[PDB]
């Protein structure tokens, strides 16, 4: 169209949404291929000007089971989108290349995700930006390594993760950033605006107070 649906905009086949709605500690998901159609604003629709996806989580967002942080972000599928992603570091190359800007930040704890490895057991690696330092985790290490302490809102950045031989490469604007080794398979790619911040270390308690990120080109690739 491309303004009506955030699939007009990315290419989402291989993906499903999570989303910071939904009855009590559980937050909605939707997947293929209805997610070819679906949009709910604020939280994931296409931008006002027309150019990318808006994902928005605020603070009081639906998280599971009622404790945790809210997201608005997507999942790796695969096959048309019917199934889960997951892929091994040691076998294969693994590719996200992504350009997406981090727009809004929750009050108190400016905390926010804004792409990921994740695999059968938590994070392996993300974008995470912190009031104006972007950082690029290690596991647990929320701050394994700053990328710039100059990150402004709204600018436009493109990274990358490539995954092979049993180490990830993350890249920021094509300059590689650190080179974590993982050996562990189950992993899938994430990325959207996953909050990190709740209703418990941030306020006021609303959906006014909020991380946003939009998204401008989302690719995967598996050889």
């Given at each position: 169209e491309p303004c009506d649906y955030p699939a007009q905009q990315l290419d989402l086949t291989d993906w499903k949404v999570t989303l910071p709605i939904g009855?009590?500690?559980?937050?909605?998901?939707?997947?293929?291929?209805?997610?070819?159609?679906?949009?709910?604003?604020?939280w994931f629709q296409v931008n006002a000007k027309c150019t990318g996806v808006q994902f928005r989580a605020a603070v009081n967002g639906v998280t599971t089971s009622g404790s945790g942080y809210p997201?608005?972000?997507?999942?790796?599928?695969?096959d048309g989108g019917?199934?889960?992603?997951?892929?091994?570091?040691?076998?294969?190359?693994?590719?996200?290349?992504?350009r997406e800007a981090f727009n809004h930040l929750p009050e108190v704890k400016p905390h926010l995700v804004g792409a990921?490895?994740?695999?059968?057991?938590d994070d392996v690696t993300v974008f995470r930006l912190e009031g104006t330092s972007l950082y690029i985790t290690k596991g647990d290490d929320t701050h394994h390594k700053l990328v710039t302490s100059d990150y402004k809102l709204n600018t436009v950045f493109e990274g990358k993760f490539v995954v092979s031989g049993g180490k990830i490469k993350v890249y920021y604007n094509g300059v590689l950033q650190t080179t974590?080794?993982?050996?562990?398979?189950?992993?899938?790619?994430?990325?959207?605006?996953?909050t990190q911040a709740n209703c418990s270390n941030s306020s006021p308690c609303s959906?006014?107070?909020?991380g946003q990120v939009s998204?401008?080109?989302?690719?995967?690739?598996?050889?």
């Open positions: 009855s009590s500690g559980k937050p909605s998901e939707i997947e293929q291929p209805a997610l070819d159609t679906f949009a709910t604003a604020p997201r608005s972000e997507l999942r790796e599928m695969t019917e199934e889960k992603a997951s892929w091994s570091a040691t076998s294969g190359t693994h590719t996200m290349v992504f990921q490895i994740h695999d059968g057991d974590i080794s993982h050996t562990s398979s189950g992993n899938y790619f994430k990325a959207g605006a996953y959906s006014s107070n909020y998204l401008y080109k989302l690719q995967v690739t598996h050889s």
